[PDB]
Symmetry: C3
Subunit: 268 residues, 3 copies
Amino acid sequence: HHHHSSGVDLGTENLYFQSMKLIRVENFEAYFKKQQADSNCGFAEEYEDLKLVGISQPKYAAELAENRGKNRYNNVLPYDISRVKLSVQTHSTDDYINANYMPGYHSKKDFIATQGPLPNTLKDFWRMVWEKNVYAIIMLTEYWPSAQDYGDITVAMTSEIVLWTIRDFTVKNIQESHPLRQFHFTTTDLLINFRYLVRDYPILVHCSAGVGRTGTFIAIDRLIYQIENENTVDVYGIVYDLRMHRPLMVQTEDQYVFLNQCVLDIVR
Amino acid sequence: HHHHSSGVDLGTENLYFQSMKLIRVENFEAYFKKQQADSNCGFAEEYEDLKLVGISQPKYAAELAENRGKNRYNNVLPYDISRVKLSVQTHSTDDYINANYMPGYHSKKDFIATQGPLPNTLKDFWRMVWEKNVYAIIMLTEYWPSAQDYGDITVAMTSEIVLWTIRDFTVKNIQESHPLRQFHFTTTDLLINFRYLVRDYPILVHCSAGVGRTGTFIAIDRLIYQIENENTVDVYGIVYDLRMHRPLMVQTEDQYVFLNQCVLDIVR
Amino acid sequence: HHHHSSGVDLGTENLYFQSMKLIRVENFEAYFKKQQADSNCGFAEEYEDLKLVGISQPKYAAELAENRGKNRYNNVLPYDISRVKLSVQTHSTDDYINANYMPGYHSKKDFIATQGPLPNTLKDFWRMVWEKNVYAIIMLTEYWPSAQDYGDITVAMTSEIVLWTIRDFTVKNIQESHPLRQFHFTTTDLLINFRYLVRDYPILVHCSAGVGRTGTFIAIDRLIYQIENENTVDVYGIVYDLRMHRPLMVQTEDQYVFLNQCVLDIVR
Ligand SMILES: [Cl-]
Ligand SMILES: [Cl-]
Ligand SMILES: [Cl-]
Ligand code: NI
Ligand code: NI
Ligand code: NI
Ligand code: NI
Ligand code: NI
Ligand code: NI
Ligand code: NI
Ligand code: NI
């Protein structure tokens, strides 16, 4: 615990000053109207203000020569500070998975946001799932046994209900097993509903780059907790916080604006 | 959790090195004598050593053009890092109140230190009281209904005992209510007694600028807890910590020296 | 809670990136073989990589003119950030003891690592023991009453079993008493056994400079907890963390390599 003087770390200064924008829930009606005017231009400004948040943070792991083929996109790289570090065997660079711990409402490790695994990273994906005791997966878009072995880990599917759909697997170290529930997702009703569905039961959330839909989902889960326990809304401040842990969370003005659309609904 | 190398933030370095001065309570007699000698000159040095603590911290919110009329004094401005951020409606700058969270003995949000509200900030004052769930106010010197509405908040007075005096109000959102107890204060006996009085029952503490009497009060409350649970005294280190969260806490050598006078008494 | 941008504090950057090297316990057999090859050369590289960790941290207290005679060696000085600060009487510099809080598995104050006391620091040593509520001492190599007074503290010996050996003392403020147990230590069996012995019963650990054997002991205690609760090993990351709080913890390649020898055993 230390405070910083002005001038040391500009990023830290942004954080103290304008990292957050609280609205009481009983004023969100009036406020949402204000921002959906001149065609969303108010939300476009909040969204533009967030654009540089957290992008100055180091990402050495992700940029090493050996870890190039483990990243789906070159512009979506995990920040060193929040990345998920796997165990090691042959060299340090085994530890790498394009994945970050994201804060939820209750703690900082509530989520792992990650990209949809590559052919050459499926082994690492399941390793991550086992090592970090992952019990739920949220697929927001075929890396699973329709049992298959992936490295030192064996994955068996044990239930499939197609309605979104729900799947149950067992993950086992081939040298001990935990069970897993994956929630596969396929108006704002559907998103809000899909989440309340999910919440009955570290939550790994992936879309394709692990950033747009992934961010919208995590965000809405947090907003809902804040709407039920506090009686307030902070879309700006949640995305800010997500950006401080992984780049591009909520990737388009439309997703940002859409989050706000979901909130406006819950509030009625 | 990170440690800093030397040279990064001199303020942080001061904090690691000489931010604190512990005296066992059974040695405070001997020590107090030492500092009240050559006419208080020992306490004058501790007091001079504290003079620059925390003043290099950013205060952007407080210095914006729109927030000028919300500050009673121009030399008492809240640091960004600890300021109380209110909810928003028309623009960001609604969030502003000249107020800081101050640490108490038990946590960092134990107190809010603030200035005595201005005519144009009474609405914000009551909003702060409601939003941040304030149950006690400590007035250390007429912003209350002798019910009145202040913005979206309604304040009714429900009890007044004049002895110091004690008042009870109800604060209500005009769109849910909590009750409030205000302790209005009017030798070191009176201060020590006024506090023990207060403690039976986030505590908002205000004098005029929210800094001298405000700091002396908070400080003495902490010292007393430290004297009862630890068996030690750290006046220097408490003021240091208060300065790291709001400027000028304990504003004159006389208040500092007076805190020490109160301690010397409790110790007998 | 703040993250830092790249470039602010290189030490902090090292911490985010390569501060840690996790091995699942069921892979340590294969990994240990790899590092004991070309005559320990793999462990020599891990050990060389750790050599600069934490050495850029400020140590003002330890370097002041008045505190020179309180340090056994001039190259083993406590970092300001973790040093143990004693109470004061005649001036600030009374607070000084060549000692640092070291993190254990459960918290950051689990250990105090310190040098074997000097003739002119025995008073401070016992003061530290009393003030910081020390219940166990681990001697890893005659500062105790075979009752003697040391400053304002009286130390009586109450039990001595010679087998390593175990001693019990009572420490008393001569102006209240707690009891104390000292564990005096005299293959990897003996170290692992000596620890399990110790653990039945802030733990002060000292060798001569408070750094080699001291570090090996603390480290092995942490590794064992990590092997029992996680099912993993991180020798590199534990020493790293110890170096961030006191210099030279695990002082030779042989101690580092020996820690790994102890782990390899437990794993069988
Ligand atoms: Cl973090
Ligand atoms: Cl703070
Ligand atoms: Cl620390
Ligand atoms: Ni800390
Ligand atoms: Ni912390
Ligand atoms: Ni603070
Ligand atoms: Ni942290
Ligand atoms: Ni630390
Ligand atoms: Ni920092
Ligand atoms: Ni904090
Ligand atoms: Ni964080």
